[PDB]
Amino acid sequence: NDTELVACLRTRPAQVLVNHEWHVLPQESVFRFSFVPVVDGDFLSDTPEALINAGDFHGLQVLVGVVKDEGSYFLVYGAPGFSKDNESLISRAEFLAGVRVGVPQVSDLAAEAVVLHYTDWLHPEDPARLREALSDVVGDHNVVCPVAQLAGRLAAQGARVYAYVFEHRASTLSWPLWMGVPHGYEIEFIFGIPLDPSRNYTAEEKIFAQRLMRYWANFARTGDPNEPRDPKAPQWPPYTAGAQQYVSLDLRPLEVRRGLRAQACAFWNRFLPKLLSAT
Amino acid sequence: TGGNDTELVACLRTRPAQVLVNHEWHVLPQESVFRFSFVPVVDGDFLSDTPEALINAGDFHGLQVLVGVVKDEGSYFLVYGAPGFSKDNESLISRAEFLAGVRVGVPQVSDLAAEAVVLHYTDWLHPEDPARLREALSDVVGDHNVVCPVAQLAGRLAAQGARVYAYVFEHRASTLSWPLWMGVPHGYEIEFIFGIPLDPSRNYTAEEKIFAQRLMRYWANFARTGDPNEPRDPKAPQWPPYTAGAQQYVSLDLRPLEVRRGLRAQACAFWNRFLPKLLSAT
Amino acid sequence: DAELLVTVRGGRLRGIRLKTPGGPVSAFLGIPFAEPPMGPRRFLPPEPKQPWSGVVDATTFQSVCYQYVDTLYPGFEGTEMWNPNRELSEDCLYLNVWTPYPRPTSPTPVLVWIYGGGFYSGASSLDVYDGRFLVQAERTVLVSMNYRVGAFGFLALPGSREAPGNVGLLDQRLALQWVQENVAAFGGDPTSVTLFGESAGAASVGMHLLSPPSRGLFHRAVLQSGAPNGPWATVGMGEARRRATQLAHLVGCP
Amino acid sequence: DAELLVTVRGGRLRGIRLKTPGGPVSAFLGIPFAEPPMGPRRFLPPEPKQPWSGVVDATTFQSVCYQYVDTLYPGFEGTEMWNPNRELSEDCLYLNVWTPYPRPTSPTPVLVWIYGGGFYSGASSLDVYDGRFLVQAERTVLVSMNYRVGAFGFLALPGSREAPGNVGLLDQRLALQWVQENVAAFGGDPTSVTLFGESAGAASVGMHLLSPPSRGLFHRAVLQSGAPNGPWATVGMGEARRRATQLAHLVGCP
Numbered sequence A: 001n002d003t004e005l006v007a008c009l010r011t012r013p014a015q016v017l018v019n020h021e022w023h024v025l026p027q028e029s030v031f032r033f034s035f036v037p038v039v040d041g042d043f044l045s046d047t048p049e050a051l052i053n054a055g056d057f058h059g060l061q062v063l064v065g066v067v068k069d070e071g072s073y074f075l076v077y078g079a080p081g082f083s084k085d086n087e088s089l090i091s092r093a094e095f096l097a098g099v100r101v102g103v104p105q106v107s108d109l110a111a112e113a114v115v116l117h118y119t120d121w122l123h124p125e126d127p128a129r130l131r132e133a134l135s136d137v138v139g140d141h142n143v144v145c146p147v148a149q150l151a152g153r154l155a156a157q158g159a160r161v162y163a164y165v166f167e168h169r170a171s172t173l174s175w176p177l178w179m180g181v182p183h184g185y186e187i188e189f190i191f192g193i194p195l196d197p198s199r200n201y202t203a204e205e206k207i208f209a210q211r212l213m214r215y216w217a218n219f220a221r222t223g224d225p226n227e228p229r230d231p232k233a234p235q236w237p238p239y240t241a242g243a244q245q246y247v248s249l250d251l252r253p254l255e256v257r258r259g260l261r262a263q264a265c266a267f268w269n270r271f272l273p274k275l276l277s278a279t
Numbered sequence B: 001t002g003g004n005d006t007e008l009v010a011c012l013r014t015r016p017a018q019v020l021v022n023h024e025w026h027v028l029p030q031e032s033v034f035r036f037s038f039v040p041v042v043d044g045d046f047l048s049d050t051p052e053a054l055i056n057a058g059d060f061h062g063l064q065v066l067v068g069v070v071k072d073e074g075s076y077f078l079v080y081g082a083p084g085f086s087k088d089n090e091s092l093i094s095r096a097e098f099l100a101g102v103r104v105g106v107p108q109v110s111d112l113a114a115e116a117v118v119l120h121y122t123d124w125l126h127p128e129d130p131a132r133l134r135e136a137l138s139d140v141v142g143d144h145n146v147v148c149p150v151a152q153l154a155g156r157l158a159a160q161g162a163r164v165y166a167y168v169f170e171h172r173a174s175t176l177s178w179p180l181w182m183g184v185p186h187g188y189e190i191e192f193i194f195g196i197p198l199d200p201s202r203n204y205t206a207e208e209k210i211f212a213q214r215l216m217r218y219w220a221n222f223a224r225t226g227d228p229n230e231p232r233d234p235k236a237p238q239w240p241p242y243t244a245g246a247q248q249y250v251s252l253d254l255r256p257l258e259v260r261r262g263l264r265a266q267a268c269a270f271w272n273r274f275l276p277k278l279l280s281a282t
Numbered sequence C, D: 001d002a003e004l005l006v007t008v009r010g011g012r013l014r015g016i017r018l019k020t021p022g023g024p025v026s027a028f029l030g031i032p033f034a035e036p037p038m039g040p041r042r043f044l045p046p047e048p049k050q051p052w053s054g055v056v057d058a059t060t061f062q063s064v065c066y067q068y069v070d071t072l073y074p075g076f077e078g079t080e081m082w083n084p085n086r087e088l089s090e091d092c093l094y095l096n097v098w099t100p101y102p103r104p105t106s107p108t109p110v111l112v113w114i115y116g117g118g119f120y121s122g123a124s125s126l127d128v129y130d131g132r133f134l135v136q137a138e139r140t141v142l143v144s145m146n147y148r149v150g151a152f153g154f155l156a157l158p159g160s161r162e163a164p165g166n167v168g169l170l171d172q173r174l175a176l177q178w179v180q181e182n183v184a185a186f187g188g189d190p191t192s193v194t195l196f197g198e199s200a201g202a203a204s205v206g207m208h209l210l211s212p213p214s215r216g217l218f219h220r221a222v223l224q225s226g227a228p229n230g231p232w233a234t235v236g237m238g239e240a241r242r243r244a245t246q247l248a249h250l251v252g253c254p
């Protein structure tokens, strides 16, 4: 039957597959996608979370980072009461609903734990806090914390790891102000797009993009983003699993912050999986 | 005539009082701090039902209530059972002492439920700073046993017809004999509400007498009118009523009153709302 | 001098003049409000003190109910201030009344203090609970009571008329019944009495609030650093029986 | 100018010079690195491009792999900047090489870009991914690739020789093998390749750190806002059937 089934898919035109693609998703969701890499035992011999803590990572340089507001982009694609065209000032009811669509496939008790930590119990009803809050839920669960897991486990097994947080808003940015620095809007700068005289970027942003291209190029040459010898500026320190140091890529010089949403990812990477396999 | 319950008690009445007292602490179910063995019972008589259930279904229109806690409710209890704690040193506990200390402060609770306390109460960037851990356990105990219970009561009377006022007593007595790391420990407002600083023999400060006189006046005022405030004096800082939404309290110390908002709101959400759901679903 | 001789419903009393920097205060200490809960009356609800002939010596605090005495830091002020300052006795159901030295001409609001102590300790006689400065300063009437603690107050075999639980609270209620009938002989106003209490004293206040038979004896309530809904302040029936059966096994009671 | 005719192992190529404010780079766009994955080769792992006579026109971008097209905010720049900017076709396994205009006379490290967009979309030809400025300002070789997305690169019937799954990831791997064989023709050092990617592209980079057969094809890795372990980048073999057989049923198959 398997060979029979695939042959039929191979006769169907390509646009009909695309049409019915979002339907196979199990349960309504956001930041979920139907066809992804499968843990088959060929390309991925085990789950990535397994492979990450008993892998061969000594001798490896890794550069990792997040943007300031990772969640925002995804909320207009399924969270109740969000658009780019209004302020997305959601109700508590809409917040509760969006937790179950931002964090799908999870028990009722687990979703209560999410609401426990990302609610502001002095201001449970404030729409602006509720908005940013749900943005952090989706941001933390999907990007910030899986990255922060990788960085520490890589570092602990002998990778030279450097960590950044990108927190500058393109003056050209077309999305509303409440989306902050959305998912994807460091790329323009890493790739030197400000240098294009077509685009309407700041003179000061052009300096910024040249400074980022330098960091990415130093890394590619030397495994270390830092300006070699050159000590004019703050030094960008490698991320360790203990001190957990990262820098802020901003129009200001490197600020060396410490701890990469520590309290949040304790919940996301450690406590929530316990609670799931216990209920 | 004997039955068996009648037997038990008839025998216990023959024992000298001092004999009973010496075996009192021995009937507790686990090692614990801030547990006592003979306490009120939900028999259906004096308490119709569990004090929680009574509050939830009560009507308290016509009642004025004055509630409050001190700054450091848990520090006192720690030295009576917590691994590494003592009046006589700085109680810079270790992390393994802290984790063990959590099973004693929160006894009769599942493993996963203490994971949840550890999640809420450690600083995962400084998991092992002894000073932060001392403070953390002092909060686990004080919160779970005093503050979050008080704050649950208070919000719930308020929302069901009561007229509530709240305070945090946060002045440390100049005379205090406990060590400085305990802060303002459980029970050390009383000296002032009863106005002991006025006693010439106890060597209190001249400003501290004023604090007690001033603090006596809120209590008398509340007794008289059901409102700690001065009625004809509007130009002094008002002490607003605590409500379930705005959650205002005042700070009682040497400074004039300051209004604050939220009575450890973020912690008490764990103790009063999530923890019960977790014990109940495991 | 004639201000120190008062007659309550069950006999005559003699009090004592207490000095304060602000002025003097009349005090009536150690007033019996229950027949001594001894012998067959251990673990049983209190009975009201029957009238007495002569004048009771209300000059000084009466005894402290039987309780464990803290010994972690012996001689240390920070723990001894909470320890008994009278002899221990099962004969301890006595209350105290403070009142302004010119006995108030008009009825005065009255405050009633319930000491805390985890329900295993405590005594109205602790120096911390002296009421003279509060009375001096605000010219109100102040009443504190003793109540059975430990197993003498709260040992329970739920369902049995012989050890029914909660008699330490019942002591508190009887003293509240006493104030209603008698506070007016000192100047107090029965229709404006305010309960206040710290720690288990506060949890006690909480429970008179939740107990209909009590909620006629007071009108407003102060809870300091404790609440009846705490994890430590009540216990189930099954568990109270379990702890009472274990005490009797440890004491040789078959 | 002569530096625009280059010969890789599969045959001759003809590139195009590109303009920067700092000066030119020279670029080879739409190099065929796989035999086109279609007809019977739909859902199958990629085969290496058989070699060709003549000169392949490598002056424009090649097609965009078949994918969903965002219609949420029609015309909106922020939406549209990620939408495909070439014809859709399953004939899409092509890669691009930027190199500094005076070709580096000594080996120079190679940056390889894997694009993002949740494994259901993306293309190497988006304007944001343009490599001229990176290669002009820092003089490294840049390579980007196109890989199969959505069901076309990730529908899996685990166990079947017909839909093995991860064929979109094998597409990326075939491109890395291509870099190892031919990047020296452009002045690049096969012994100093750095993967970089965003969103699903960062997830992909990570997955290459964890698949042994891709570990000899690069030496450093940068992961921008993505990771292979996250909750969205992987599914189990049983969910992949559930999701693949449902598609078949929504389309009439059996």
Ligand SMILES: *[C@@H]1O[C@H](CO[C@@H]2O[C@@H](C)[C@@H](O)[C@@H](O)[C@@H]2O)[C@@H](O[C@@H]2O[C@H](CO)[C@@H](O[C@@H]3O[C@H](CO)[C@@H](O)[C@H](O)[C@@H]3O)[C@H](O)[C@H]2NC(C)=O)[C@H](O)[C@H]1NC(C)=O
Pocket (backbone or CB within 6 Å): B081, B082, B083, B084, B085, B086, B088, B089, B090, B091, B092, B093
């Ligand atoms: C702060 O102090 C506590 C409490 O210790 C007490 O106070 C100190 C000032 C000292 O004078 C102590 O002698 C005193 O008892 C310290 O914790 C205590 O550590 C001691 C070891 O020094 C423990 O004693 C041991 O007990 C085990 C059985 O459990 C025996 O096998 C040993 O031979 C030894 O007797 C003691 O149990 C422990 N107390 C508690 C409550 O845990 C604490 O270490 C100290 N803090 C620092 C940072 O030094």
Ligand SMILES: CC(=O)N[C@@H]1[C@@H](O)[C@H](O[C@@H]2O[C@H](CO)[C@H](O)[C@H](O[C@]3(C(=O)O)C[C@H](O)[C@@H](NC(C)=O)[C@H]([C@H](O)[C@H](O)CO)O3)[C@H]2O)[C@@H](CO)O[C@H]1O
Pocket (backbone or CB within 6 Å): A042, D045, D046, D047, D048, D164, D170, D171, D173, D174, D177, D181, D213, D214
């Ligand atoms: C570069 C050269 O000189 N010759 C290559 C030849 O080496 C290459 O064979 C492949 O080499 C790679 C090295 O990265 C692996 O060892 C391939 O094995 C696997 C893989 O893991 O990629 C095995 C795996 O089970 C296969 N998956 C399937 C069948 O579902 C894949 C698969 O065949 C893909 O097509 C690989 O892209 O291969 C090893 O076969 C070949 C390409 O296969 O190309 C020559 O030019």
Ligand SMILES: *[C@@H]1O[C@H](CO[C@@H]2O[C@@H](C)[C@@H](O)[C@@H](O)[C@@H]2O)[C@@H](O[C@@H]2O[C@H](CO)[C@@H](O)[C@H](O)[C@H]2NC(C)=O)[C@H](O)[C@H]1NC(C)=O
Pocket (backbone or CB within 6 Å): A080, A081, A082, A083, A085, A086, A087, A088, A089, A090
């Ligand atoms: C913000 O917008 C969303 C999306 O609504 C769309 O865009 C608006 C500009 C408006 O023209 C809507 O009618 C569009 O559908 C709102 O979500 C919808 O809100 C309307 C009422 O405002 C409601 O009738 C719909 O059922 C909602 N659809 C849902 C929830 O899926 C959202 O409420 C807006 N927020 C605010 C604060 O106005």
Ligand SMILES: OC[C@H]1O[C@@H](OCCCCc2cn(CCCc3ccc(O)c(/C=N\O)n3)nn2)[C@H](O)[C@@H](O)[C@@H]1O
Pocket (backbone or CB within 6 Å): B025, B026, B027, B028, B029, B030, B031, B032, B033, B034, B077, B080, B081, B186, B187, C082, C116, C117, C118, C198, C199, C200
């Ligand atoms: O199984 C039995 C377990 O008991 C232990 O015995 C310990 C003996 C006494 C322990 C104790 C003393 N204290 C004093 C608390 C001070 C207090 C209480 C209430 C208040 O209200 C106030 C303030 N104002 O009133 N202060 N607390 N605990 C074993 O050591 C252990 O190992 C055993 O497991």
Ligand SMILES: [Cl-]
Pocket (backbone or CB within 6 Å): A074, A077, D118
């Ligand atoms: Cl999306």
Ligand SMILES: [Cl-]
Pocket (backbone or CB within 6 Å): A106, A107, A108, A109
């Ligand atoms: Cl469920």
Ligand SMILES: [Cl-]
Pocket (backbone or CB within 6 Å): A122, A123, A124, A125, A126
């Ligand atoms: Cl609000």
Ligand SMILES: [Cl-]
Pocket (backbone or CB within 6 Å): none
């Ligand atoms: Cl605000």
Ligand SMILES: [Cl-]
Pocket (backbone or CB within 6 Å): none
């Ligand atoms: Cl320079």
Ligand SMILES: [Cl-]
Pocket (backbone or CB within 6 Å): A256, A257, A258
């Ligand atoms: Cl910081």
Ligand SMILES: [Cl-]
Pocket (backbone or CB within 6 Å): A165, A260, A261
């Ligand atoms: Cl961050």
Ligand SMILES: [Cl-]
Pocket (backbone or CB within 6 Å): A261, A262, A263, A264, A265
């Ligand atoms: Cl955090």
Ligand SMILES: [Cl-]
Pocket (backbone or CB within 6 Å): A117, A263, A264, A267
């Ligand atoms: Cl959290």
Ligand SMILES: [Cl-]
Pocket (backbone or CB within 6 Å): B125, B126, B127, B128, B129
């Ligand atoms: Cl630390």
Ligand SMILES: [Cl-]
Pocket (backbone or CB within 6 Å): none
């Ligand atoms: Cl520090």
Ligand SMILES: [Cl-]
Pocket (backbone or CB within 6 Å): B162, B163
């Ligand atoms: Cl009102």
